[PDB]
Write an enzyme that holds these catalytic residues in place. Structure first.
Site: not given
Ligand SMILES: [Zn+2]
Ligand SMILES: [Zn+2]
Ligand SMILES: [Zn+2]
Ligand SMILES: [Zn+2]
Ligand SMILES: [Zn+2]
Lengths: 515, 7, 385, 181, 369
Positions: C150
């Site tokens: 992320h």
């Molecule tokens: Zn995740």
């Protein structure tokens, strides 16, 4: 047609408009001759003197122009949280407390190891070298912070930093004393963790299988709502409406049924009858004169409908309760009002909730009769003895014999409705939630049978069914007379069904009727 | 609110 | 294009024995994301404890890849971002108030002691694990401490501060013409897809929920821009996907990728989020549902890097990671559990298993038949290598 | 105190307030047609056909006053919260480059139109007499008519995601993190 | 309270032969465990509520002796290359440089010039209003002697004199359109803190609808067959999806046969989530729009990225000047189907003829090629 939209978009949109109608869209394509949401673009603003170690391939091949963020594709408000049972939340809390203990103990142990090596160095070095020894930041080991956290947590953070300084500086002292104190904290926290492990294990045993019971915890409330007259007619009416819509927009004439309830396995009817008989014998609402009529009606309806040779039930039920004390025939329409339909829908609901139990019973008896322990839960008594101390574990015998026996125990009330849930949980993984309501569904079935006989006109329609089935040969005219006769016993505004049955395949198809 | 469910 | 079949038991491939370089630092795991945070580095240690207590250290090499350096992280991130990470601590976050807001550090990706060390360890393994795959020293690198997919160029999004996968693929790209990043974490590889969104040398194929979950991105039509168009695949899924379906969508999709975008290396994020019982997940997957993904990727006989990303049950992730480690070594692990240092953590039956729950599978056919139909149409453009 | 902005400029302003706040896309600065350029073209175009030094000087005084008030007000009452980081970065760039900021030569026509829209409130806030108010409103309405005659030169609709030569540029997560944080 | 002794406690000449470990007492009984203190076992209450009424096999210590320090790859470091709680300027929350004198408060990036949080002028900071108050003394004669002089010195722009004058006395203020321009478009509407919204933005849900919904409710129309009420509420009939042309709900005994359906926020046409390929109900963000509505942005490539937008809805200023119809009459795209932002009124047959001759004369043009 005004040069604001092009051919491609026009055809793409008409696809949504004139879609499933393949012929019209084919004409459209033939005549007109038709042969990312996220990631905004950062234009060029500034990418000068970032990434002090980037290289040629790394700089260029990567993507810097197009950027995406959670907030672009969230409309400034989003990212809901998936709902979790209170049992899942208890599991999370236990996990978070276990992690707290483990994180504070294992790190203390890593620091204890480092300090033990250091102290070993100190002891085998003479006084002069002791006084001149000086560890560097990180104590020479790979980490630079873990020991810092460990000392801060233990040693009065102000004096904790005073320590982390003294340790790096003269360790001819400090390191021994710090090691002692870390040992004391280690043993204390280990004691506390061992004590807490009991309660954590017990809570896990209590709540684990429930946590994995998503569709079963809402069950027993969804059954009450969705297993009713309104919903049952709604489903059939909806299938009929879909057929009539593929009548408006697809073939007009063809459908002659809307449900296809099937009964591959006999010998489940007798289990349903046994459960009904147990409930009847338990209920105080009915009086004994009524119970016998109810039992006879239940045993008679199925034997008449599926042609189950009434004596077969007589012998099967008698054999079942004998060991208790030791411890041109073709399709045949039925026709019905709403009263008969919901009864004959409760019957198939029970049958469908027991067929899955049958198949899974083969597989799951195979499974359970080979449930292995491991080695170390028994030495330390780490397994759940609760379901065994009161004998609800499915070890020893069949699964589609203990489910029904437990259901009987539940209907009579001898078995708590909570322990029955757990027993069906950690004996099927979580695949028998539809059995959580077996007393309620059988209660509703018997109530609907009672309505079936002690209503008035419904009993007359049932009698007409009795007359028709026991016939030998029937003609389309006879079927028509059947329809009008049953209608006569229902208002012109009531719904009539056409429950059908084929002896060959034991499959029944409903044919929801329009006035 | 515009992040993971987090703690 | 979507036809569902039952889920068959996982069987090792006899013709694909592989050398496995498994990376693990004895320190990653001593850092905590806070006192209530979902992500917990202790999961990595628990996976090691099973991997070691089982017999697997005899079948693999344990490497402690050296921590990454500032100039080495900066190959993807920015100077100021890395400079921020290397100096921010719980006792000095105030002085960095502008930067903390600037880089999205402090609220859900908190400032915990040793933050820099953790990212370096995660980054070093992914970079070095690709190095071994590069210099023909191993066929599978296992770094169950990176996988932080992320983190983006200059922001710490979703518990991921450093997108070590980009560093790994960057290293994999200094040798292999092409890479394929299959991610199977329930969330979406926004950071990884963003980094290689424009390039055709990396195809990020991510399986995720999409619609109301953290990444927010990953819609079916996010297929890359410029030369990297059609070289980004997203498979949006609904709640309660089960093994029979995941296996019936993951397998045909990955086959078509590997068949047309013929890669020379593979990175496989193995996030425990997509497993039943997650703290922040809504996928109903057993170990074998998770593992069937890893085995299929192995089947193709291409150098692979397996990284552990999201997992917050910390027990259903340790098990599968052990079950994955002892599945790239061509030995199917025992269902019992050895006496680990962390055995209390395991459920009623202390067994190597994560049990699917009864959640309703809403990923109906005729939807996965449209998601896959679209993906196949896009991949028809990658047909030409 | 009742300014008559044509509906076209109303639509342009409503595109602006629906960009800088909903789409989070600040303007491209320095713009292709700054305030100086638009005002100077307005002067050189209209004064070419005016009658009498009285009118040719009313125009010249109005443009000069507009520019001087723009320069002193933009930093004060013409930026949405998002744009107040672009403004700060330009200010710091000027300070480092040793070239005092001059918004008229940096910001574009959209901010001039913002000034026009906010003008009546500012006029009402003063003790400024009725004659001057009438003259200001008349001149501004004439200017807006002129801008209407040249709307598809200063407020064309271009996609920031499809062309770098667009009046708006999408911001960055790290930009609006500081701007709105 | 024993003094916080500096542990080393040097004895003779800095030999530090004797130590003095800090007293722990604190950081112990800290009761920061997620339970009770870490050194204490589970509480009697927790016990009562919670209870139910092989080290030689540890292959862990054997890890340091099989872990090989790994250093391949670049590895060279790749050396080279009292006070208000809301901002008085934008009317929002955040860090503030509260005035010592004035009660107003501002952000650091809302002042003028914007001030860096780490490079504060410090000392005492005054807002523009208090600076003017002390610069004017609040009396009117001196203010007159000052402002008239200002006007006189600004004769070149006397027409703007007082406008220039009054800026100095005003604190910075975030720009917002006056209501007399927003009102021209009834659709638009301001947001909570200036989030400028349109008709396309969904009404926000409340905490009761998200945080209090029980298992099977809210976004949770994905967990159970419980929301079988995709039946037309007003009429009690079945919401039929526009594509498949049927409603799927199966039964409580076959919930796997049900297919999710949603109703468009703009025009209440039901759609199957599997017919308009989607993975979730919106429930949030913007209002869902069918694939059955007309475009607003019509981005066109002939690059020639010429944009077309549908004029925003105007107050009932709105004009509908009637055609004489037939071909031509090139509207931009705006239309009002009938049986200066002038919404043209095209009726029904004109569209037929216009499309007919468009496609036909285009085919003849293709013939020309
Ligand atoms: Zn995740
Ligand atoms: Zn403010
Ligand atoms: Zn003040
Ligand atoms: Zn609609
Ligand atoms: Zn549909």
């Amino acid at each position: 047609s005004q040069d604001i939209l092009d051919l491609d978009d026009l055809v793409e949109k008409v696809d949504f408009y004139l879609g499933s109608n393949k012929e019209l869209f084919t004409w459209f394509k033939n005549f007109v001759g038709y042969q990312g949401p996220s990631y905004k673009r950062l234009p060029k603003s500034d990418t000068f003197m970032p990434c002090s170690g980037r290289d040629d391939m790394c700089w260029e091949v990567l993507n810097d122009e197009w950027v995406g963020h959670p907030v672009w594709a969230s409309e400034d408000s989003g990212f809901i949280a998936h709902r979790k049972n209170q049992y899942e939340e208890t599991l999370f809390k236990i996990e978070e407390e276990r992690h707290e203990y483990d994180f504070y103990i294992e790190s203390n142990l890593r620091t204890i190891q480092c300090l033990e090596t250091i102290v070993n160095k100190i002891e085998n070095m003479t006084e002069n070298e002791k006084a001149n020894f000086k560890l560097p930041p990180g104590l020479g080991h790979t980490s630079m912070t873990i020991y810092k956290k460990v000392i801060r947590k233990v040693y009065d953070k102000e004096r904790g930093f005073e320590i982390i300084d003294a340790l790096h500086e003269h360790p001819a002292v400090t390191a021994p004393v710090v090691l002692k104190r870390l040992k004391q904290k280690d043993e204390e926290w280990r004691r506390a963790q061992r004590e807490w492990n009991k309660v954590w294990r017990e809570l896990e045993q209590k709540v684990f299988f429930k946590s994995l019971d998503h569709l079963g915890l809402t069950f027993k409330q969804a059954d009450k709502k969705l297993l009713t007259t309104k919903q049952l007619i709604s489903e059939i009416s909806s299938i009929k409406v879909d057929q009539t819509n593929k009548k408006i927009h697809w073939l007009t004439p063809k459908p002659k049924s809307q449900l296809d309830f099937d009964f591959p396995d006999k010998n489940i009817f007798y289990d349903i009858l046994c459960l009904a008989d147990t409930f009847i014998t338990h209920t105080t609402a009915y009086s004994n004169p009524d119970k016998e009529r109810l039992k006879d009606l239940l045993k008679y309806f199925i034997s008449l409908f599926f042609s189950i040779s009434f004596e077969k039930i007589e012998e099967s039920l008698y054999s079942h309760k004998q060991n208790v004390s030791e411890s041109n025939r073709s399709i045949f329409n039925l026709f019905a009002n709403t009263n008969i339909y919901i009864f004959f829908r409760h019957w198939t609901t029970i049958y469908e909730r027991l067929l899955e139990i049958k198949q899974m019973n083969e597989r799951v008896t195979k499974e359970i009769n080979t449930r292995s322990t491991v080695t170390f839960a028994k030495d330390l008594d780490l397994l759940s003895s609760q379901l065994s101390e009161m004998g609800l574990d499915f070890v020893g015998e069949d699964a589609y014999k203990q489910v029904l026996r437990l259901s009987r125990r539940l209907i009579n009330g001898d078995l708590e409705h909570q322990w029955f849930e757990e027993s069906l949980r950690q004996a099927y993984n979580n695949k028998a939630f539809k059995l959580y309501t077996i007393d309620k569904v059988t209660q509703s079935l018997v109530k609907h049978a009672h309505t079936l006989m002690t209503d008035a006109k419904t009993a007359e329609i049932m009698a007409l069914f009795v007359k028709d089935r026991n016939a030998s040969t029937t003609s389309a005219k006879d079927q028509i007379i059947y329809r009008l006769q049953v209608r006569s016993h229902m208002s012109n505004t009531e719904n009539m069904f056409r429950i059908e049955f084929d002896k060959r395949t034991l499959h029944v198809s409903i044919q929801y009727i329009a006035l | 609110x515009x992040x993971k469910x987090x703690x | 294009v979507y036809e569902a079949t039952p889920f068959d038991p996982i069987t090792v491939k006899p013709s694909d024995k592989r050398r496995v370089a498994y990376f693990y630092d004895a320190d990653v795991g001593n850092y905590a994301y806070g006192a209530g945070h979902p992500m917990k580095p202790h999961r990595i240690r628990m996976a090691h404890s099973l991997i070691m207590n089982y017999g697997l250290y005899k079948k693999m090499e344990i490497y402690r890849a050296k921590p990454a350096t500032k100039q080495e992280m900066c190959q993807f991130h920015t100077d100021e971002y890395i400079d921020f990470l290397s100096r921010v601590t719980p006792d000095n976050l105030e002085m960095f108030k502008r930067e903390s807001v600037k880089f999205n550090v402090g609220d859900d990706c908190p400032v915990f002691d040793g933050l820099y060390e953790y990212c370096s360890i995660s980054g070093g393994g992914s970079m070095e694990g690709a190095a071994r795959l590069n210099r023909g020293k191993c066929d599978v690198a296992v770094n169950y401490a990176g996988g932080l997919h992320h983190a983006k160029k200059s922001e710490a999004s979703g518990f991921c501060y450093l997108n070590d996968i980009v560093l790994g693929i960057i290293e994999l790209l200094r040798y292999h013409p092409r890479v394929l990043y299959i991610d199977i974490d329930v969330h979406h590889g926004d950071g990884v897809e963003e980094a290689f969104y424009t390039t055709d040398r990396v195809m990020t194929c991510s399986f995720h929920k999409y619609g109301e979950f953290f990444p927010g991105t990953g819609e079916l039509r996010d297929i890359g821009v410029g030369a990297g168009k059609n070289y980004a695949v997203n498979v949006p899924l609904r709640d309660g996907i089960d093994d029979a379906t995941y296996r019936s969508v993951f397998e045909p999709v990955i086959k078509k990728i590997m068949e047309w975008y013929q890669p020379s290396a593979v990175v496989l994020q193995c996030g425990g989020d997509s497993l039943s019982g997650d703290r922040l997940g809504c996928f109903n997957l057993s170990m074998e549902g998770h593992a069937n993904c890893v085995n299929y990727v192995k089947s193709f006989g291409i150098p692979m890097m397996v990284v552990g990303g999201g997992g917050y049950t910390m027990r259903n992730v340790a098990r599968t990671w052990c079950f994955e480690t002892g599945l790239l070594n061509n030995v199917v692990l025992d269902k019992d559990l050895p006496y680990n240092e962390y055995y209390e953590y395991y459920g009623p039956d202390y067994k190597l298993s994560v049990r699917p729950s009864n959640m309703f599978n809403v990923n109906t056919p005729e939807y996965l038949d449209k998601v896959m139909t679209n993906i196949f149409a896009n991949l028809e453009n990658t047909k030409y290598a | 105190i009742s300014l008559q902005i044509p509906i076209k400029l109303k639509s342009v302003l409503v595109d602006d307030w629906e960009y800088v706040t909903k789409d989070k896309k600040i303007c491209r600065l320095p713009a292709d047609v700054t305030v100086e350029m638009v005002l100077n073209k307005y002067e050189h175009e209209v004064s070419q056909e005016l009658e009498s030094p009285g009118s040719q000087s009313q125009l010249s005084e109005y443009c000069a006053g507009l520019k001087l008030y723009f320069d002193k007000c933009l930093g004060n009452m013409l930026l949405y919260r998002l744009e107040r980081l672009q403004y700060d970065e330009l200010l710091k760039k000027s300070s480092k480059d040793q070239k005092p900021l001059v918004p008229i030569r940096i910001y574009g026509a959209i901010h001039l139109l913002r000034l026009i829209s906010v003008l009546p409130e500012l006029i009402s806030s003063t003790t400024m007499d009725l004659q001057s108010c009438q003259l200001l409103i008349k001149q501004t309405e004439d200017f807006l008519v002129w801008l209407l005659m040249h709307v598809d030169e200063y407020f064309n609709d271009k996609d920031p995601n499809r062309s770098d030569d667009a009046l708006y540029v999408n911001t960055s997560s790290q930009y609006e993190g500081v701007a709105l944080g | 309270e024993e003094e916080p002794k500096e542990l080393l406690e040097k004895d003779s000449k800095g030999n530090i032969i004797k130590l003095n470990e800090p007293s722990t007492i604190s950081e112990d009984s800290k009761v920061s465990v997620t339970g009770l203190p870490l050194n204490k076992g589970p509480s009697e209450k927790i016990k009562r509520e919670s209870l139910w009424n092989n080290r030689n096999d540890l292959k862990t210590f054997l890890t340091e002796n099989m872990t090989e320090e790994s250093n391949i790859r670049s590895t060279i470091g790749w050396n080279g290359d009292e006070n208000e709680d809301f901002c008085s300027a934008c009317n929002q929350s955040g860090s503030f440089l509260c005035c010592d004198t004035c009660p107003k408060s501002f952000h650091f990036l809302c002042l003028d010039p914007p001030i860096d949080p780490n490079n504060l002028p410090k000392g005492d900071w005054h807002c523009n209003e208090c600076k003017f108050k002390i610069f004017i003394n609040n009396s009117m004669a001196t203010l007159k002697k000052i402002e008239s002089n200002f006007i006189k010195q600004n004769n070149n722009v006397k027409i703007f004199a007082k406008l220039l004058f009054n800026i100095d006395s005003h604190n910075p203020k975030q720009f917002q359109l006056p209501n007399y321009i927003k009102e021209t478009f009834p659709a638009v509407k301001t947001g909570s803190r200036g989030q400028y919204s349109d008709e396309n933005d969904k009404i926000p849900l409340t905490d009761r609808q998200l945080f209090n919904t029980s298992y099977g409710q809210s976004i949770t129309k994905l967990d159970s067959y419980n929301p079988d009420t995709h039946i037309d509420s007003n009429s009690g009939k079945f919401l039929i999806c526009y594509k498949c042309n049927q409603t799927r709900l199966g039964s409580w005994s076959h919930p796997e046969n049900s297919r999710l359906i949603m109703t468009c926020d703009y025009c209440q046409t039901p759609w199957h989530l599997d017919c308009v390929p989607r993975a979730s109900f919106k429930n949030l963000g913007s209002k869902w729009k069918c694939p059955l509505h007309s475009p607003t942005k019509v981005y066109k490539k002939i690059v020639n990225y010429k944009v077309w937008k549908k004029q925003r809805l105007i107050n009932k200023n709105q004009l509908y000047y009637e055609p004489l119809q037939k071909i031509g009459y090139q509207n931009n795209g705006n239309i009002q189907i009938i049986p200066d932002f002038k919404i043209t009124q095209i009726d029904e047959n004109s569209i037929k003829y216009d499309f007919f001759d468009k496609i036909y004369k285009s085919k003849m043009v293709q013939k020309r090629k």
